[PDB]
Amino acid sequence: SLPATFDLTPEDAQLLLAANTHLGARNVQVHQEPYVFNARPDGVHVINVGKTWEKLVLAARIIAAIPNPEDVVAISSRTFGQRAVLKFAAHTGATPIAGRFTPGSFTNYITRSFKEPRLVIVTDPRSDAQAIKEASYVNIPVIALTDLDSPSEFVDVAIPCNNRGKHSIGLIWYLLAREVLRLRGALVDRTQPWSIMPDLYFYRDP
């Protein structure tokens, strides 16, 4: 189906290993076992990064299939993903919601933050649980940046990645944006790396 130049190139694996996206939780929940390439001594479970790359590319194909990019919605209440979702918003259509989700954003058509998206990407199914719950009320597919412990309820596409490291969250959102742009007339040639680096997606103190 894929040609594939879409295999995990060793420079992309280089970024994923450098962002510690493979360092998973110590308690894998039963729907997240397929994404586990063995534990480590001292308990950390390694995520199979190639499966992260395949799920990410599938997620970007789902995003690219959405006709209007502005009704792709990306959610991150966690600060570690707030800049990443905003940058994903700036580079794609990607109507962003960073911070509080304001219960009633998908229902309650009279709220000022009322959106009617075609797809929702969340940084954390635990922290953005209200948005996932509201998605299940109005037929919205959900992609989520999931660790091995995060729940998979009403999550259709799970990208297996570290949910704790800001580099991991910033990289996955940056890679998702890069792949989405590659799969349309915005990053015309797939071989050469993107001009902007994964760092501007990372949260910064204070």
Binding site: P67, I110, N139
Partner: protein
Amino acid sequence: GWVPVTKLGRLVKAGKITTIEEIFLHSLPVKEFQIIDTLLPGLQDEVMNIKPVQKQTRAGQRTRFKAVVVVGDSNGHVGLGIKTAKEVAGAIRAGIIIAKLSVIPIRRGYWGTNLGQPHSLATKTTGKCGSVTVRLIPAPRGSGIVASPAVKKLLQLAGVEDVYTQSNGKTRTLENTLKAAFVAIGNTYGFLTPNLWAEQPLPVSPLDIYSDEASAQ
């Protein structure tokens, strides 16, 4: 007049969606009763109960009136609406809106041979709300709606000609009984039968086809 605030109402107003069956097929949530008014103009309503409910207070009992409303064309659609309000007229109007917003399809079928148009249900169905269980059984032609007046009126508004009804529980709780019946008729399109086993190409929703004139900027 009416200016849509949702994508579905915007498409229905523009005429890109012309039947409510597309809304059923793609499970699109309905949040504006003007969509139902546009797509099903021949929709008749009926108030089935107005009973008061009271709330004890520091000073006496505050009374509101709860209206149960059933809408439906006699050709395969009904809606149920429950609304309590200060005034009976207000509860009735808002019940009519809620009833229209909840409009569901029903699967009508043949009791025996498929001669003519469907006249009954295609399957035995049950619904439950509170203690009340309402069971609908397909009935032969000319049987009529063998049901109590309230359930009979809901089925008449649905378009069923012949049906058998069995009830259990405190059926005098009218709102529970009507809800149980509304569930049972809603289950008609949930029940999988061998003539629905055939695979289908899984169409594309008009929310995607007409995404251009939806989501107005």
